Symmetry: C2
Subunit: 247 residues, 2 copies
């Protein structure tokens, strides 16, 4: 066995300390090159990490989720490995963990998965992750809010079905509420999510209009944060086009 | 009125000669910069061109379709203008024109539209364009075959639903048959379409396998055409991954 294969073996230790440490080392390795990530994938690390997500020890869950989130930030092949191992359905369940770090890592992993191919986003939608993520937008934990908003923004950059899922879950109204959040990062992600939702079907534009989103986006044109301004402008222009008709 | 607005006005002439000529000049203008294309769009040219598609004069239809195809090769905003004007449903109908030039231009326009955002591809799928395009893959007209295959390849680069539409229409078997076509251009497009279909759901991989596509792609690894080889290799690697599970 090579070094990565040894770490992956330690993930199966019966000692939480050993498990957490192996997952932590794998997470660090995953934060490196795409080649390092491919090493973990070829070593069967994803399947094992996905199993660790079901650990009764939140510490193990958090570290395994963190490793997968780092892996999910790699090549599409890495993301596909996670999806094919059934990792999305499990990460969606961890979104409701009472442990905030588990929630955060789970959301960050889903957000990274959502930055992948349309098939990766579909996996999240089919797993019912959108409705759960929308609920997390109102988490009392700022970090959880940020990751949830970022995940939704990425999901909204996918196919029509993904945006429709956000709309049906009532996410538009919630995201519009977050446009005036004092948490800069949250506001930026909420603005990007809406700009993306606005490039979808006309029905999504209608939801934005109903939520009074046009008036809120208009005020953000004066935001001192250029990223928020930039997203607000893109969202407004998309709204002006009216979205794509559902024929 | 500016020069483009004048041309767009001539499209409504009662003289086919004037109409054809205006559409032809607009097509030429559209083959230029993105700014030139935006000029036509802002002048309301798309709506008018889409109406000309319903002309009883095949000569007018062909020239209007040609102008729209050139327009569709521009910015996503140009493609959206076509979709929002109901141009896709009409172009789909022209695919079955007995006039080969109309078929070719209609297919080329749809192919260009399909190179756009996922919402543009969805419009084609919802209009039932996939099944019609699959039928055109066996057209006795080589050019029509090429445009149809190119359109399907682009459609296959979209969301899961788009690939599923190709599979349900029996397109996979047909595309595999075209892999051994003597028409280089057709073969290249068929290979790209399959490579794209292979990055979809596992069910699409299964269709490729059933069609005996793995063995045909394997033989193309020896093709003297590097593009075919390159697509065959990509398709084979996608097949090896097994596609994305439908959870």
């Amino acid at each position: 066995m090579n070094d990565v294969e040894k770490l992956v073996k330690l993930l199966t230790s019966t000692d939480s300390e050993t498990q957490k440490e192996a997952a932590r080392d794998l997470a660090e390795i995953a934060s490196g090159p795409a080649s390092a990530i491919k090493a973990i994938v070829d070593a069967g690390g994803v399947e094992v990490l996905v199993k660790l997500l079901t650990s009764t020890d939140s510490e193990v869950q958090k570290e395994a989720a963190r490793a997968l989130a780092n892996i999910a930030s790699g090549p599409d092949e890495a993301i596909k490995a996670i999806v094919d191992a059934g990792g999305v359905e499990v990460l969606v369940k961890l979104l409701t963990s009472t442990d905030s770090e588990v929630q955060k890592e789970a959301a960050r992993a889903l957000a990274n998965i959502a930055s992948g191919p349309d098939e990766a986003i579909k996996a999240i939608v089919d797993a019912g992750g959108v409705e759960v993520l929308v609920k997390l937008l109102t988490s009392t934990d700022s970090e959880v809010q940020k990751e949830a908003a970022r995940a939704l923004a990425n999901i909204a950059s996918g196919p029509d079905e993904a945006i429709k899922a956000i709309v049906d879950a009532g996410g538009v109204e919630v995201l519009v509420k977050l446009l005036t959040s004092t948490d800069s990062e949250v506001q930026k992600e909420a603005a990007r999510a809406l700009a993306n939702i606005a490039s979808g079907p006309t029905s999504a534009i209608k939801a934005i209009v109903d939520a009074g989103g046009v008036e809120v986006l208009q005020k953000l044109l004066t935001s001192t944060d250029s990223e928020v301004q930039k997203e607000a402008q893109r969202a407004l222009e998309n709204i002006k086009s009216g979205g794509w008709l559902e024929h």
